[PDB]
Amino acid sequence: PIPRRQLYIGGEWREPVKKNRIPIINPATEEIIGDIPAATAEDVDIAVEAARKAIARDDWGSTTGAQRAKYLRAIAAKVLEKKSVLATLESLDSGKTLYESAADMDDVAGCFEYYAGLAEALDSRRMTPVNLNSDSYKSYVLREPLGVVGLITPWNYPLLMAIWKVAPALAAGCAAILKPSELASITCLELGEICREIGLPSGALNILTGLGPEAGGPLASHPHVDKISFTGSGPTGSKIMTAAAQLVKPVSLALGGKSPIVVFDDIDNLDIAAEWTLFGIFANTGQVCSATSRLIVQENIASAFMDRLLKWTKNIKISDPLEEDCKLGPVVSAGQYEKVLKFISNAKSEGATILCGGERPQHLKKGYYVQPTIITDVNTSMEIWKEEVFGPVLCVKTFKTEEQAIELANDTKYGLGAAVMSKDVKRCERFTKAFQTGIIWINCSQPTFNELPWGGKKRSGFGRDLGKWGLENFLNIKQVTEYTSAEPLAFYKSP
Smallest distance from the beta carbon of 25 to Na ion, in angstroms? 4
Amino acid, single-letter form, for residue 118: L
Q: How far is the CB of 46 from a copy of itself (least distance, A)?
A: 22
Task: Between 55 and 228, name the residue whose CB sits nearer to ligand NAD.
Answer: 228
> What gap in Å lies between CA 9 and CA 6, rounded to an integer?
9
Question: Which of 232, 231, 208 is CA-nearest to residue 219?
Answer: 208
Nearer to a copy of itself, 19 or 489 (CB): 489
CB of 103 to Na ion, least distance (A): 20
Dihedral, CA of residue 307, residue 311, residue 316 and residue 317, to nearest 10 = 150
Burial label, 248 (beta-carbon count in 10 A; 0-12, 13-18, 19+): exposed
- For 87, counting Cβ atoms within 10 Å of its Cβ (0-12 exposed, 13-18 middle, 19+ buried), the class is buried
Q: Which of residues 180-199 bind Na ion (CB under 5 A)?
A: 183
Locate the DSSP E strands across 194-305.
205-207, 227-231, 251-254, 260-263, 294-298
Q: Is 394 in the site for Na ion (CB under 5 A)?
A: no
Q: Which is nearer to a copy of itself, 13 or 312 (CB)?
A: 312
Longest dimension (CA), the chain: 94
In the complex, least distance from residue 220 CB atom to ligand NAD, rounded to whole angstroms: 6
441 binds ligand NAD (CB under 6 A): no
Angle ∠(276,161,82) on CA atoms, nearest 5: 95
Q: Is 91 in the site for ligand NAD (CB under 6 A)?
A: no
192 and 12 Cβ atoms separated by less than 8 Å? no
* Cα separation, 291 vs 320, whole angstroms: 22
Paired sense of beta strands 137-145 and 475-483, if any: antiparallel
Q: Please, which residue, 333 or 446, has the CB nearer to a copy of itself?
A: 446
**Among 97, 187, 231, 422, contact with ligand NAD (rule: CB under 6 A):** 231
Q: Which residues neighbour 424 within 8 Å (Cβ) at sequence distance 6 or greater?
A: 264, 266
- Give which of Na ion, ligand NAD, a copy of itself, none residue 25 binds (C-beta under 5 to 8 Å, depending on kind): Na ion
Answer yes or no whether residue 259 interacts with ligand NAD by CB under 6 A. no
Nearer to Na ion, 338 or 429 (CB): 338
Taking CB under 6 A as the rule, which mask of x and - marks residues 364-403 in contact with ligand NAD?
A: ------------------------x-x-------------
Question: Between residue 106 and residue 165, which ones bind ligand NAD under the rule CB under 6 A?
Answer: 152-156, 161
User: Applying CB under 6 A, does 331 fall inside the site for ligand NAD?
Assistant: no
Which of Na ion, a copy of itself, ligand NAD, none has residue 256 at its interface (CB below 5 to 8 Å by kind)? ligand NAD
- Name the minimum Å distance from CB 390 to ligand NAD: 6
Report the residue from 18, 70, 126, 239 that binds ligand NAD according to the rule CB under 6 A: 239
Local structure of 24: helix, strand or coil: strand
Residue 236 contact among a copy of itself, Na ion, ligand NAD, none, beta carbon within 5 to 8 Å by kind: ligand NAD
Using CB under 6 A as the binding criterion, the count of chain residues that bind ligand NAD stands at: 30
7, 9, 25, 375: residue in contact with Na ion (rule CB under 5 A): 25
Q: How far is the CB of 440 from ligand NAD (least distance, A)?
A: 15
337's enclosing H/E stretch is: helix 334-350
Q: Specify whether the CB–CB gap between 352 and 375 falls below 8 A.
A: yes
User: Which of residues 146 and 183 has its CB atom nearest to Na ion in the complex?
Assistant: 183
Check if the beta carbon of residue 400 is closer than 8 Å to that of residue 298: yes
**What's the number of CA atoms in the CB half-sphere (13 Å) around residue 311?**
9
How far apart (Å, rounded) are the C-alpha atoms in residues 436 and 415?
A: 6
Residues 286-345 that bind Na ion (CB under 5 A): none
Contact 177, 149 (CB under 8 A): yes
The residues that touch Na ion, with contacts defined as CB under 5 A, are 25, 183
The residues that touch ligand NAD, with contacts defined as CB under 6 A, are 152-156, 161, 179-182, 212-213, 216-217, 220, 231-233, 236, 239-240, 254-257, 289, 388, 390, 416, 454
